[PDB]
């Protein structure tokens, strides 16, 4: 062992509930890949990281099979929340 243990990068709704914004992710070469119906965004890493801090965006809903966020074509207010920034 010593396989992986990265955790997976959140949005939130404006009262704090978290959704993944990626299906799968390289944790020092090991995949990890999130249960399949899982909800997510797609909108990735990179997408939640562009996000200014506090605003509201309209985040597009998926749902993850094998490792990526299939979007439904449907929308939710979401949230990057930083501790400090």
């Known amino acids: ?4 243990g990265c955790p ?5 709704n404006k ?3 978290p959704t993944i914004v990626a299906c ?4 020092n070469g ?5 249960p ?3 909800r997510c965004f ?3 890493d990179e997408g939640l990281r562009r996000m200014t801090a506090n605003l509201p965006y309209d985040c597009p809903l998926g749902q993850c099979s094998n490792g ?4 439904k074509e449907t929308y939710e207010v979401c949230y990057r929340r930083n501790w400090r920034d």
Not at 30 to 34: C, G, Q
């Open 1 to 4: 062992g010593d396989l992986g």
């Open 8 to 12: 997976f990068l959140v949005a939130e």
């Open 15 to 17: 009262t704090g509930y």
């Open 24 to 27: 799968k992710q390289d944790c």
């Open 30 to 34: 090991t995949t990890e890949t999130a």
């Open 36 to 38: 399949n119906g899982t």
């Open 42 to 44: 797609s909108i990735g």
């Open 68 to 71: 990526d966020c299939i979007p």
